[PDB]
Design a protein around this nucleic acid. Structure first.
Ligand SMILES: [Zn+2]
Lengths: 1223, 105
DNA sequence: TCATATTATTACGCCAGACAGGG
DNA sequence: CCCTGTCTGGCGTCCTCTCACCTATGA
RNA sequence: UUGAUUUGGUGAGAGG
């Protein structure tokens, strides 16, 4: 069964693997994030309720009044989205917050408040999201791009090689909170443990232990195990568990029980450990040279004399043993400092420590954190107890506590947001364990260690900034509060919240202007994962590994769609099936595989879960039950693609599109292209302009439907039914009764957005693709947007392309185009320019909007009214007048009248005017005369434009040939576009050839149907040929149910197929070559894909037959009459005497540094002298040169450049006396 | 025209010889009209007239007496590019050592 | 409108060059 | 007193095109 | 004597 615009033109779908999970809604990141931000969600998480339950109830410092919270709300926007874009306002909503002030008496923690008051106060306006995932910030339509940042929670990083210049590794450990102070632990090459807070000075780390009220003995209890020396009959014997001797040299005689176990000289093996455990050896008598290097654990005091024997962490000598033996402390606890495993790092750090108690530890930490200003008991204790341990200024979130408990192998995952003693001690213990050998480091590119921020999280953080500023203001007003003469808007202020949230949505590194020239480009700018932004890395610094693809990107981030240039791999784009985890990580679908039978249930995993399991490959042959047809299958275990058994796997990939994104899964024959050319192909495919006549890719992938629907450029029907079709203004849909509400009788009236400006000056336009009185279903499309054709996605157009060299006109990457491409207007795109004119009151009275234009004669009053402003629609070009806008006293009158820029033509499509109340409306103040004029240039195609296919084959269209000179085959049809075969062996993008052959076969079927329907046959022969065309070959998913198309839906389908039968070649499970040959045999075309072609010039055959087919070629928006520029003489800058830069400023070319070196490389001394003195800077030289040229005397009078005298005055404006010496 | 470029230190007599007037007031411009400040950073007497051969305030609107300076204007009378070569000097109350000769490493 | 004058983040990678510490 | 970690400064590609956004205070 | 403001500076994106 199919829907009714699905039976219009059903695309022949190759593809063998049955898909189990349909594609999710492609804008779900933006929409789910912002629906989390604004939603009335009780239990508090997450949203605006989390912000209000953190900041409220505010109580002042015993001021006996406590403003509390009830509920919030967002009213209607005063401006709907269209008139909001037209006017220039934000698309926002007012945030109505109920606030309940209760005010206490004296001595009421428990007492009832003396008075209440409550009102629905107004704080800020928050910008709502449009239904397509965009904002409208100040007239322009912007997009917040989801960030990719390091997760909160501990990270054990190594930095193995570069420091110390000696090959000795370090090991640092960063506890990254979501909000607050950063705590890092780090070794130094003396093997001492150092703490630093917020990248400040370096403190030896155990001082933080001494700041947590730990004595030295408790610290040595934590990080060391005790070895017991018992004072006995002679020589102070030792308790010896045999584990401690692992891998060391026997220094003494190891004997017990009257038996010599191990003699001196040999190392202790594990067999000797087994001998000591079998022989039950604990107590052995040691020599006095064994204790002469060990370190005491706890303190001991001489009992009778009443003084100290030794402090804790003191090494022992023989006379120290003579001190402690004669006193009466029989047990001696020593620190086992194994050189192999259990290193003495804490103990040597305690030897570095200049402190002894808790108070001096806090004084040293306070002198680290805030220097100069004195360290007193209260101040240092408040500092250190609010560094990590208060809920205000330090908060590992739920993500942070999950990562923090997971990296320490804790059992639980939910806990308190602050740290504790035990958490810092566990981070130090795991760091020491990593130094000892057990456990390993973490990598930072691993996407289980890399969280995503999105729109709701970022706006919530900015809103929390605004709320803590307004609670400091409420605490300000309340202690100065007199009652009862205030109601809660003398306390609260709507200004800081609105200021902060408009600061983020207007001027941030991620709230950025939407790439809007294409439905693909909208839908792939909204699905973007940037590594940049606040708190993340920068473009010009890092690095090599964060720019590189890591094995956790499989199914989360597209491997091949990343922009080339200065930021590669920082601006990653999200995969097709990848959702976002509850904590913000990237979870991708897999199919749960209990045993041999691969089950059709799906189950989502992130990269810290994908490592443990064994996950299969998407295309592994399984037949009729889910059993893998082989006994061994390629899977990947822990980021390592390896071959495993038939019955070991726990998950399988869902579908074979899932590695790549929605930009680079629209490329058919992706698997035959190179990776580089797929990258260039996807990045150029974002850049296509919408043509005037949208044209249905013959070789698509079937993902065109989901992109063209899910990006909101087409008018998808909300409720199904029939149609009334007034449509000149709006589609009117009568609703079927089952989908129709009992009250609100109701018929749906869709607004078509006609010719208007996009963000890239292209033309967004919707056209109805349903007739009058025609059934439509829910979810069906009604109006085709820009670059769409019956709900599919038509960026460029499909043209007949020959691969051959043609007389040099397609030399490096150029492209030679017939005249049939430019006669049919089949790339003639439509651009729209907005031009503003204002008549602000700068000085000497206000400016004026009158046709009575001066000096200039009846060449002003022309495309305007009888007395002012461009009339409505003519063919205006360059140098015309649109809005007469000139003042008197500015003879002394002048011409600021906004005219048409140089080089452009067009038709005035629209004139908007919300001018200074007097022009003879709704807008803001200040600005007076506000006249916006919308031109619409129609640019065709010309030598110099840029076209490209989908595979990375760039081209600048070189010659626009006549129809006659084209290479025609023996049937008579010219070929449209000639490309060059030499690009194909080097640039290994062989997929454009299979697209060429399969598009040739598609139009072969289209020509066959066009013959069977033009030379008109009764519909039995058409339905037989359509059935043969839709069966065609191997086991596929489509077949068709064609005998249920009522003898008319066969004919309407065959009316929509006579331009070529559309073929879906999916991404990695595409059409094989034998099916291309078999489809080329169904059409009457030659099997090789190659036709003999004659030459239009000479009429004689090209030897060695050439390839002709249909490639889907796109017109990119790098048009040549936006790049052509020239300057002889005009205006310059102010500070310098050199010319201005750019095209919108009529400026000249920067003759840079390497061009000066290139002229020095020749003998061009005079060319360089005029290149930097006369042509550029020296004012007397250039006026004398212009007069010398127009007299007919090519001679320069050089002089000295002005910018060098600017250099002299800037150097001389220091204390520097730079001069110019003798004649 | 000229051989080598010589660089040396700037004596206070040399800086007073470069100068054309002490810049006292920090007031940049009027900002509500179009006129500058007399006598602030952007002065008239210390540097020159904004307009070419015009007293900014009011006298000499032809080409006869280029130079006269009335008391109502406290303005020189030369070219529009004359201010680009003229520099002012600030009489620093308290001596301040140069940062280029104190932190050059 | 017309003078008043500066605070609560961290996440590069060498590579010279100068400096207090110690055998 | 001659090695020495350690700290501080000083580099880090040219050319071009499009867009938006710009200090608070205040009797 | 016959006319006028971006360069300034930031941020984001793009081309070769
Ligand atoms: Zn004068």
């Amino acid at each position: 069964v199919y829907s009714y615009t699905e039976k219009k033109r059903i695309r022949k779908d190759f593809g063998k693997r049955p898909q189990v999970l349909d594609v999710p809604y492609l804008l779900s990141i933006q929409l789910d994030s912002f629906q989390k931000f604004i939603e009335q969600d009780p239990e508090g998480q997450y949203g605006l309720e989390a912000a209000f339950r953190s900041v409220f109830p505010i109580q002042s410092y015993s001021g006996n009044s406590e403003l509390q919270y009830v509920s919030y709300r967002l009213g209607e926007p005063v401006f709907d989205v269209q008139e909001c874009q037209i006017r220039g306002v934000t698309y926002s909503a007012p945030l109505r917050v109920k606030l309940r002030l209760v005010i206490y008496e004296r001595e009421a923690p428990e007492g009832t408040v003396k008075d209440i008051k409550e009102q629905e106060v107004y704080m800020g306006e928050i910008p709502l999201m449009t239904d397509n995932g965009t904002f409208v910030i100040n007239g322009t339509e912007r997009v917040i791009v989801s960030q990719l940042h390091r997760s909160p929670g501990v990270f054990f990083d190594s930095d193995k090689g570069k420091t110390h210049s000696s090959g000795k590794v370090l090991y640092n450990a960063r506890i990254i909170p979501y909000r607050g102070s950063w705590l890092d632990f780090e070794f130094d090459p003396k093997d001492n443990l150092f703490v630093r807070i917020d990248r400040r000075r370096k403190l030896p780390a155990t001082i933080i232990l001494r700041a947590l009220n730990y004595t030295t003995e408790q610290i040595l209890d934590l990080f060391f195990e005790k070895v017991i020396f018992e004072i006995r009959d002679n020589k102070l014997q030792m308790e010896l568990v045999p584990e401690r001797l692992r891998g060391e040299t026997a220094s003494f005689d190891i004997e017990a029980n009257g038996k010599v176990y191990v003699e001196k000289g040999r190392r202790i093996t594990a067999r000797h450990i087994r001998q000591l455990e079998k022989d039950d050896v604990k107590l052995i008598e040691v020599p006095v040279e064994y204790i002469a290097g060990k370190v005491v654990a706890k303190d001991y005091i001489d009992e009778s004399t009443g003084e100290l024997i030794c402090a804790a962490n003191m090494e022992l000598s023989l006379d120290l043993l003579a001190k402690l033996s004669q006193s009466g402390h029989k047990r001696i606890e020593t620190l086992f400092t194994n050189d192999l495993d259990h290193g003495p790092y804490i103990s040597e750090t305690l030897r570095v420590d200049p402190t002894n108690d808790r108070l001096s530890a806090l004084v040293e930490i306070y002198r680290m954190m805030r220097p100069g200003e004195p360290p007193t008991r209260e101040a240092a204790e408040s500092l250190f107890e609010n560094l990590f341990f208060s809920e205000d200024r330090y908060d590992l979130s739920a993500v942070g506590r999950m990562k923090f408990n997971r990296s320490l192998l804790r059992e639980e995952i939910e806990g308190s947001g602050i740290l504790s003693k035990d958490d810092i001690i566990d981070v130090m213990k795991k760091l020491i364990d990593i130094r000892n050998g057990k456990g390993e480091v973490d990598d930072i590119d691993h996407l289980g260690n890399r969280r995503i921020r999105s729109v709701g999280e970022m706006a919530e953080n900015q809103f929390r900034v605004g709320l803590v500023r307004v609670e400091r203001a409420v605490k300000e007003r309340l202690s100065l509060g007199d009652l009862d003469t205030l109601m809660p808007q003398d306390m609260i202020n709507a200004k800081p919240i609105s200021a902060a949230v408009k600061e983020f949505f207007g001027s941030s590194q991620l709230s950025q202007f939407m790439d809007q020239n294409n439905p693909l480009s909208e839908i792939t700018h909204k699905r973007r994962i940037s590594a940049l932004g606040p708190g993340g890395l920068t473009r010009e610094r890092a690095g090599f590994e964060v720019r590189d693809v890591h094995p956790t990107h499989y199914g989360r981030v597209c491997p091949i769609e990343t922009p080339e240039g200065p930021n590669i791999g920082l601006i990653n784009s999200l995969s097709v099936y990848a959702q976002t985890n509850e904590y913000g990580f990237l979870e991708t679908p897999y199919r749960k595989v209990t045993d041999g039978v691969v089950t059709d249930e799906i189950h989502y995993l992130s990269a810290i879960e994908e490592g443990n399991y064994v996950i299969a490959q998407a295309n592994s042959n399984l037949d009729e039950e889910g059993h893998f047809v082989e006994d061994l299958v390629t899977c990947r275990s822990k980021g390592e693609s390896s071959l495993f058994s038939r019955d070991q796997v726990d998950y399988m990939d869902v579908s074979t599109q899932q590695v790549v994104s929605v930009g680079a899964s629209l490329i058919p024959f992706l698997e035959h292209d190179d990776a580089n050319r797929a990258l260039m192909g996807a990045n150029m495919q974002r850049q296509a302009v919408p043509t005037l006549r949208a044209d249905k890719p013959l070789v698509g992938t079937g993902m065109e439907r989901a992109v063209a629907v899910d990006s909101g450029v087409t008018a998808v029907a909300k409720r199904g039914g029939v149609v009334q079709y007034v449509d000149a203004s709006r589609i009117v849909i009568k609703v079927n009764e089952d989908e129709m509400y009992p009250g609100e009788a109701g018929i749906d009236i869709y607004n078509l957005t006609k010719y208007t400006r996009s963000n890239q000056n292209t033309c967004i336009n919707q056209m109805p693709c349903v007739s009058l009185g025609e059934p439509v279903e829910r979810g069906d499309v009604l109006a085709d947007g820009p670059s769409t054709d019956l709900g599919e996605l038509a960026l460029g157009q499909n043209m007949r392309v020959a691969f051959m060299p043609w007389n040099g006109y397609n030399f490096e990457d150029s492209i030679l185009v017939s005249e049939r491409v430019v006669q049919e207007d089949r790339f003639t795109t439509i651009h729209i320019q907005e031009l503003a004119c204002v008549s602000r009151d700068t000085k000497l009275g206000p400016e004026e909007i009158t046709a009575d234009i001066p000096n200039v004669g009846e060449a002003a009053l022309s495309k305007l009214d009888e007395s002012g402003i461009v009339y409505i629609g003519a063919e205006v070009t360059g140098g015309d007048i649109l809005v007469g806008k000139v003042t008197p006293k500015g003879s002394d009158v002048k011409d600021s009248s906004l005219r048409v820029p140089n080089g452009v033509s067009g038709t005035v499509i629209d004139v908007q005017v919300f001018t200074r109340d007097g022009v003879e409306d709704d807008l803001a103040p200040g600005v007076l005369k506000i006249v916006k004029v919308y031109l619409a240039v129609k640019r065709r195609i010309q030598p110099g434009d840029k076209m490209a296919g989908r595979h990375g084959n760039k081209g600048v269209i070189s010659k626009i040939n006549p129809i006659e000179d084209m290479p025609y085959d023996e049937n008579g049809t010219p070929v449209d576009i000639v490309l060059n075969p030499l690009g194909v062996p080097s640039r290994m993008n062989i997929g454009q050839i299979l697209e060429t052959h399969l598009g040739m076969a598609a139009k072969g079927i289209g020509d066959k149907i066009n013959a069977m329907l033009k030379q008109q046959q009764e519909v039995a022969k058409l339905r037989e040929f359509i059935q043969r065309a839709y069966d065609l070959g191997a086991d596929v998913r489509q077949k068709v149910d064609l005998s249920t198309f009522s003898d008319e839906e066969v004919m309407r389908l065959a009316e929509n197929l006579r331009k070529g039968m559309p073929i879906a070649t999916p991404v990695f499970d595409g059409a094989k070559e034998a099916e291309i040959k078999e489809l080329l045999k169904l059409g009457d075309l030659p099997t090789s894909g190659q036709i003999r072609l004659y030459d239009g010039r000479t009429g004689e055959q090209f030897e060695r037959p050439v390839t002709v087919g249909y490639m889907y070629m796109l017109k990119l928006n790098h048009l040549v009459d936006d790049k052509m520029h020239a300057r002889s003489t005009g205006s310059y800058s102010l500070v310098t005497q050199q010319p201005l830069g750019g095209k919108a400023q009529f400026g000249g070319q920067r003759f840079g540094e390497m061009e000066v070196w290139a002229l020095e490389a020749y003998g061009a001394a005079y060319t360089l002298q005029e290149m930097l003195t006369v042509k550029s800077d020296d004012v007397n030289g250039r006026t004398k040169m212009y007069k010398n040229i127009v007299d007919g005397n090519h001679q320069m009078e050089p002089g000295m450049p002005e910018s060098f005298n600017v250099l002299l005055k800037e150097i001389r404006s220091l204390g520097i006396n730079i001069e110019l010496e003798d004649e | 025209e000229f051989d080598a470029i010589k660089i040396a230190l700037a004596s206070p007599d040399m800086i007073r010889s470069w100068s054309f007037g002490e810049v006292k007031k920090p007031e940049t411009i009027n900002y509500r009209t179009f006129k500058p400040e007399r006598d602030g950073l952007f002065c008239a007497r210390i540097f020159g007239p904004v307009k070419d051969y015009e007293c900014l305030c009011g006298k000499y609107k032809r080409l006869k007496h280029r130079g006269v300076i009335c008391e109502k204007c406290g303005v020189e009378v030369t070219q529009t590019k004359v201010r680009r070569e003229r520099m002012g000097h600030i009489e620093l109350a308290s001596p301040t050592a140069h940062i280029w000769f104190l932190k050059s490493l």
